[PDB]
Amino acid sequence: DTRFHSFSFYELKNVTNNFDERPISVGGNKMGEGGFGVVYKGYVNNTTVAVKKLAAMVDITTEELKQQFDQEIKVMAKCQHENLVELLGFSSDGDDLCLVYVYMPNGSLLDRLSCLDGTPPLSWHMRCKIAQGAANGINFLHENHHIHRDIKSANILLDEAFTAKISDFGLARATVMTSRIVGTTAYMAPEALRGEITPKSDIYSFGVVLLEIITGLPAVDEHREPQLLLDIKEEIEDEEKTIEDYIDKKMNDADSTSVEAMYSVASQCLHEKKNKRPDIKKVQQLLQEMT
Amino acid sequence: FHSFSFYELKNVTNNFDERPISVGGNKMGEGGFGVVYKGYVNNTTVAVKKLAAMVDITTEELKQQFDQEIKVMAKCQHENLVELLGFSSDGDDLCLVYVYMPNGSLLDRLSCLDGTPPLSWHMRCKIAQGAANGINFLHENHHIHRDIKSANILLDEAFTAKISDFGLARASQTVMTSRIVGTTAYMAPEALRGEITPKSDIYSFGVVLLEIITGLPAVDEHREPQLLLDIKEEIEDEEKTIEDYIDKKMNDADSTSVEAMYSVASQCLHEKKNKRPDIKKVQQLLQEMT
Amino acid sequence: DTRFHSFSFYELKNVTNNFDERPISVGGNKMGEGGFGVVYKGYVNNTTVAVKKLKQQFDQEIKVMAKCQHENLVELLGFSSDDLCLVYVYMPNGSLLDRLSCLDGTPPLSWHMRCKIAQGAANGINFLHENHHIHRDIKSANILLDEAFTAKISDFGLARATVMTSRIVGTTAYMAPEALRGEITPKSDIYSFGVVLLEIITGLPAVDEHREPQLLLDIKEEIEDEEKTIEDYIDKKMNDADSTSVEAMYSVASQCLHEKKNKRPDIKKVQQLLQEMT
Amino acid sequence: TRFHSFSFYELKNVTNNFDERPISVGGNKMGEGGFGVVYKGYVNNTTVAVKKLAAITTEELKQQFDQEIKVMAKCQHENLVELLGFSSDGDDLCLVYVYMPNGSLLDRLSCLDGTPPLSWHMRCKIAQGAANGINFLHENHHIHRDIKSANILLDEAFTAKISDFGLARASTVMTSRIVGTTAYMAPEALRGEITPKSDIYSFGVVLLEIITGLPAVDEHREPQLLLDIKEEIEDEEKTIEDYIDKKMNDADSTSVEAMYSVASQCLHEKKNKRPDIKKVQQLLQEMT
Numbered sequence A: 001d002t003r004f005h006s007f008s009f010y011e012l013k014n015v016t017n018n019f020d021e022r023p024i025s026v027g028g029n030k031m032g033e034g035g036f037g038v039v040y041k042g043y044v045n046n047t048t049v050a051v052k053k054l055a056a057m058v059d060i061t062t063e064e065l066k067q068q069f070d071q072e073i074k075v076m077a078k079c080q081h082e083n084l085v086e087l088l089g090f091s092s093d094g095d096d097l098c099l100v101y102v103y104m105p106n107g108s109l110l111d112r113l114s115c116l117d118g119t120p121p122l123s124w125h126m127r128c129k130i131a132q133g134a135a136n137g138i139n140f141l142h143e144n145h146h147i148h149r150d151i152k153s154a155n156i157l158l159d160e161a162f163t164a165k166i167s168d169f170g171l172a173r174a175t176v177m178t179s180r181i182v183g184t185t186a187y188m189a190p191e192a193l194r195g196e197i198t199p200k201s202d203i204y205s206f207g208v209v210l211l212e213i214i215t216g217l218p219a220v221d222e223h224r225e226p227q228l229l230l231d232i233k234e235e236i237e238d239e240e241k242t243i244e245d246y247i248d249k250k251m252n253d254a255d256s257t258s259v260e261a262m263y264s265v266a267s268q269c270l271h272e273k274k275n276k277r278p279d280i281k282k283v284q285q286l287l288q289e290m291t
Numbered sequence B: 001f002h003s004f005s006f007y008e009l010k011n012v013t014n015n016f017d018e019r020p021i022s023v024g025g026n027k028m029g030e031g032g033f034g035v036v037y038k039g040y041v042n043n044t045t046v047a048v049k050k051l052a053a054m055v056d057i058t059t060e061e062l063k064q065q066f067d068q069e070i071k072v073m074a075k076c077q078h079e080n081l082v083e084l085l086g087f088s089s090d091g092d093d094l095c096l097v098y099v100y101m102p103n104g105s106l107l108d109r110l111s112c113l114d115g116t117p118p119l120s121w122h123m124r125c126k127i128a129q130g131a132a133n134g135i136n137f138l139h140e141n142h143h144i145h146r147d148i149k150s151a152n153i154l155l156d157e158a159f160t161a162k163i164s165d166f167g168l169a170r171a172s173q174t175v176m177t178s179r180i181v182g183t184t185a186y187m188a189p190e191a192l193r194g195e196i197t198p199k200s201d202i203y204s205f206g207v208v209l210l211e212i213i214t215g216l217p218a219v220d221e222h223r224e225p226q227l228l229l230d231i232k233e234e235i236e237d238e239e240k241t242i243e244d245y246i247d248k249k250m251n252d253a254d255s256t257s258v259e260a261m262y263s264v265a266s267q268c269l270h271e272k273k274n275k276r277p278d279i280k281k282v283q284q285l286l287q288e289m290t
Numbered sequence C: 001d002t003r004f005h006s007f008s009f010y011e012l013k014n015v016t017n018n019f020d021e022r023p024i025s026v027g028g029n030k031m032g033e034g035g036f037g038v039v040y041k042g043y044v045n046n047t048t049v050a051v052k053k054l055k056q057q058f059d060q061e062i063k064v065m066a067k068c069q070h071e072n073l074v075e076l077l078g079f080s081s082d083d084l085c086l087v088y089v090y091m092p093n094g095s096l097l098d099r100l101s102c103l104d105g106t107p108p109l110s111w112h113m114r115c116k117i118a119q120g121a122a123n124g125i126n127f128l129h130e131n132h133h134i135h136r137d138i139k140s141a142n143i144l145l146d147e148a149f150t151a152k153i154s155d156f157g158l159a160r161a162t163v164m165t166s167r168i169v170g171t172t173a174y175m176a177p178e179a180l181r182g183e184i185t186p187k188s189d190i191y192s193f194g195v196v197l198l199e200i201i202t203g204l205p206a207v208d209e210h211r212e213p214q215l216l217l218d219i220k221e222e223i224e225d226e227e228k229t230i231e232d233y234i235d236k237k238m239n240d241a242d243s244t245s246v247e248a249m250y251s252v253a254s255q256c257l258h259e260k261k262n263k264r265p266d267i268k269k270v271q272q273l274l275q276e277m278t
Numbered sequence D: 001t002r003f004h005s006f007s008f009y010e011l012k013n014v015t016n017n018f019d020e021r022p023i024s025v026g027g028n029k030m031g032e033g034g035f036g037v038v039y040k041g042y043v044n045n046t047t048v049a050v051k052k053l054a055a056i057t058t059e060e061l062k063q064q065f066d067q068e069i070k071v072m073a074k075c076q077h078e079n080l081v082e083l084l085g086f087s088s089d090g091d092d093l094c095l096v097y098v099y100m101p102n103g104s105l106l107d108r109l110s111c112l113d114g115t116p117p118l119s120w121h122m123r124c125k126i127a128q129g130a131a132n133g134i135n136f137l138h139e140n141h142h143i144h145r146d147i148k149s150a151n152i153l154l155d156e157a158f159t160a161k162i163s164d165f166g167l168a169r170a171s172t173v174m175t176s177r178i179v180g181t182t183a184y185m186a187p188e189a190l191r192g193e194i195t196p197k198s199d200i201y202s203f204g205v206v207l208l209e210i211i212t213g214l215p216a217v218d219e220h221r222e223p224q225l226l227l228d229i230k231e232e233i234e235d236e237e238k239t240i241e242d243y244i245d246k247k248m249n250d251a252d253s254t255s256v257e258a259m260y261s262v263a264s265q266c267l268h269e270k271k272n273k274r275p276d277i278k279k280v281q282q283l284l285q286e287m288t
């Protein structure tokens, strides 16, 4: 189990231009945000890093944010894999709790699918590699008895070779129930919205991610019919649509056979009955057979 | 223009090969009056449109549109207009042959069809300028286009905008027609009533400018609002801002020039045709924007 | 417009941002120069114009440009004498010389566009010769291109209404042997047009001090003495050239470049040959 | 790693039996290099580039094929070409890659086939991307030995991809068989030594090609070697402004001077006075 480097809060402040909140495109250091903090670009010990300065951006407490900080370090100390983000160190000495990670040059899958800031669209070849890599990451977590609990495309990061790296382990748990229902509702399994804690919920959320990969559509869009991307499964099932109607137009290399194979995995992951969903090993196998 | 035999164009296009060019076929796209294919004629890359009534028009109307397109192209040459090279009319088939546009349509570049990189704000400004220059040329030369839409604004190797599709064009006192033809999502209210006026080209150009700002198609059945022109009323009623709709697939869009393009779009979209700017005013406003 | 406009020097100073010498590509007003003046971009009455800030050649240019109005000649719109200025209709695509060099990032001209430009330039020379005028300075810097890439012949300061002269004028790299010796004849305009045709085929300027051979017209000899072929020199910046029409244009250029002025085609034959080419 | 083994028969189907007509007229040939001819094709709906290797001796060529596969198995990066597969059946050797829609940097700088001149903004991004690719190779202890603009490929968005790893070496050593393209080679590489410092020198020549739009060598030009403009500028007989590519309209003087300073540093006659690739990346990052 990994022992991590302790960074001085002031060194992190220095290397992020005092946690410069302007976007990196403008000339600032802000890379993005999530429900549990703001991520900044840093340059420490001769290397570009990602610095997450923790902050309750969702309806959670100071103590809950501290328990998630501790949980994230514990998960990162136990879990190292080609398809998981790597923690370099942390800071707990100064004004705010910080986590320092190996920099992900291509940001999140969510942003690459939306082509945020004008980045070029991901090819079908790249999308297949990403789906396989994300499934491999989840498989490693599940094999090592960890439940992610927050699988979403904003938490699947992309490195210098567009290798998928699962991130955000603050809610991870190493069938039981909870009184604090947490997560992004557009991705959550029905049993997760009720408070159940199970690896089968990670599978369902991964099915939503696969629909995002196929369609390039966000999981929720208030101004779209259906508002929830997971509802396209019923549209296709009740023959009012085909996956061809929803395929992202921003690729030139997709083929109907492998797109239908990825859709079939997603459809299976999205079974409303948790016990009827494939386990991650079956997901991995089906995605390997796809290519 | 070169008069080809239909069989020569069958050879050029690999028998109008229906597979997309993206996978080594010849098909490039379709429209209301035919399907366009890629080909090579004497080492020149060309676009070949094989005419077909794909919308509700007669075969006699299609032949009239073919004759009209050739007439307009014989009279009108300008860097912001497509260039016709030839045609075929032998037998029961009609084809038009054009200089190939390596970047296809603005509609497809805005949707990043086939995985093309999203257009920068700087490029979008030059394309809006070029398209206005093309419409100005047509109006200066007493022609009403009647089919202004982003599928009809093509882009060459340097993203120079080229107005295309002249089959419905009319020589230009507002006249009326009994045959209402066009793409509903871009049409001015008076055009939907059958009026023929260059003021309607301005309106349709306003819709194009909203597509340029937002990256959204003029119509989407599974979207609220279904019609992109409806965002003007949303912004006017203050329930939304242009910032809420700006294309997020660019990082070089300054608030000032975006608001300046939106103001030209808003003016073009005036419900009352006589209150819209003319194309010369649209040109000067887009020139002042940059 | 239907009239020539007499402009005050103050108005032309104003519309050119005080004859701003910085090139237009950087935000100034300078568009080009060489020979008898600097040309600036101006904006008069919501219209872009070209303003040439420069005496005999000034009066001659106004005189010849008022008499010679044709679709393939540049259009004079006004003047200023109260520095001497000539005001012309703006040519949005600048010179053929600059478009062949892709100056300022413009895309290479296609072979199709190059054929249309060659035809247009020959039609302009035909109008001048039909109207008993000798250009005397035919070169790609003097072939301008409008908003439709229509060829417009420019620079009429040296133009003349076979005689010999004491003042040998013109651009050396384009000049016929007899023109270099003082002869004033339209047959020399044909020779210079042949050099332009080699520039169009090859995309190479007539002279390049940092190139071997420095002079483009020598290529005719390299090809004739079978040391090279027209294929070795075809501009690689085109994707639509075909061997047949390139050989046809080269043949016209070779005929234009006959060392013996009487063996050269006249402008009407040049027009006919370029018409048969396409 | 997992590279797909194609039969030569499948690759004939992919390339229309290696159709030698150029792609600009509807054929499959895209260009040649010192070790093979590259063809366009499709594997299902995927556009690919297929290099059919051709002569050096057959064993030397086979070694280069083997070395290419090993480098590609170990090195995956957005600024490196991506190998999809190969064919090694019979007496034919093919390498199959992800297609690069904008071809080579050398061809885009020359505007081959009528492509528009690259803007200064695009040239800056390409220089940075190419430096990122070289950095990744050097971090992975590989010396390229053949850095040149013909080996810097460009995708649909003009992302720079380093290619051709047949001559790459693992990591100062000396060699009897001197390989590379003379116009790009460091003096020490011309004397036979193998060092990643020579990759830096070659990259400096590429930077001069990006600034000027001129090929590294032109037998019908004065000076013949582009690297010689450095001395002309040093001895004040020419300026950076004199050599800036005139086919650009968006080139600001400050960042052109910043790229030229990087190029000059890379071209240091003394191998040990040259910046390493991390310093080149930092300098190029500061330039924008």
Ligand SMILES: CC(C)(O)[C@H](F)CN1Cc2cc(NC(=O)c3cnn4cccnc34)c(N3CCOCC3)cc2C1=O
Binding pocket: A031, A032, A033, A034, A039, A049, A050, A052, A085, A086, A101, A102, A103, A104, A105, A106, A107, A108, A111, A117, A119, A154, A155, A157, A167, A168
């Ligand atoms: C192609 C491009 C436009 O130039 C590039 F896209 C710019 N970048 C880099 C980047 C890194 C991130 N992150 C990291 O490098 C990172 C490393 N470990 N880690 C752990 C948790 C969160 N983020 C990270 C995040 N994250 C922000 C927070 O949400 C997730 C994405 C975003 C971005 C971004 O936009």
Ligand SMILES: CC(C)(O)[C@H](F)CN1Cc2cc(NC(=O)c3cnn4cccnc34)c(N3CCOCC3)cc2C1=O
Binding pocket: B021, B028, B029, B030, B031, B036, B046, B047, B049, B082, B083, B098, B099, B100, B101, B102, B103, B104, B105, B108, B113, B114, B116, B151, B152, B154, B164, B165
């Ligand atoms: C992805 C890419 C490589 O970057 C590029 F996008 C591929 N291309 C080229 C292209 C040319 C077109 N067309 C022409 O070349 C053309 C020339 N004159 N003309 C006149 C009418 C219609 N089309 C044309 C059309 N048109 C098809 C019909 O609808 C309009 C767009 C579409 C495309 C296309 O997708």
Ligand SMILES: CC(C)(O)[C@H](F)CN1Cc2cc(NC(=O)c3cnn4cccnc34)c(N3CCOCC3)cc2C1=O
Binding pocket: C031, C032, C033, C039, C049, C050, C052, C074, C075, C088, C089, C090, C091, C092, C093, C094, C095, C098, C103, C104, C106, C141, C142, C144, C154, C155
């Ligand atoms: C596509 C583009 C890059 O944006 C464009 F190329 C910019 N422009 C416009 C332009 C007009 C010129 N000229 C005219 O408009 C003009 C009109 N009549 N006239 C008569 C003599 C000289 N010039 C002219 C000249 N000339 C300057 C003098 O030398 C010849 C070229 C140069 C340029 C130029 O670079």
Ligand SMILES: CC(C)(O)[C@H](F)CN1Cc2cc(NC(=O)c3cnn4cccnc34)c(N3CCOCC3)cc2C1=O
Binding pocket: D023, D030, D031, D032, D033, D038, D048, D049, D051, D081, D082, D097, D098, D099, D100, D101, D102, D103, D104, D107, D112, D113, D115, D150, D153, D163, D164
């Ligand atoms: C004009 C245009 C439409 O804009 C475009 F330019 C056309 N294209 C595409 C292209 C791809 C290449 N290559 C590849 O796609 C490629 C992919 N991996 N790879 C690895 C080694 C060599 N080539 C490749 C090469 N290469 C040929 C061999 O020399 C290097 C350049 C050249 C070209 C070319 O001219």
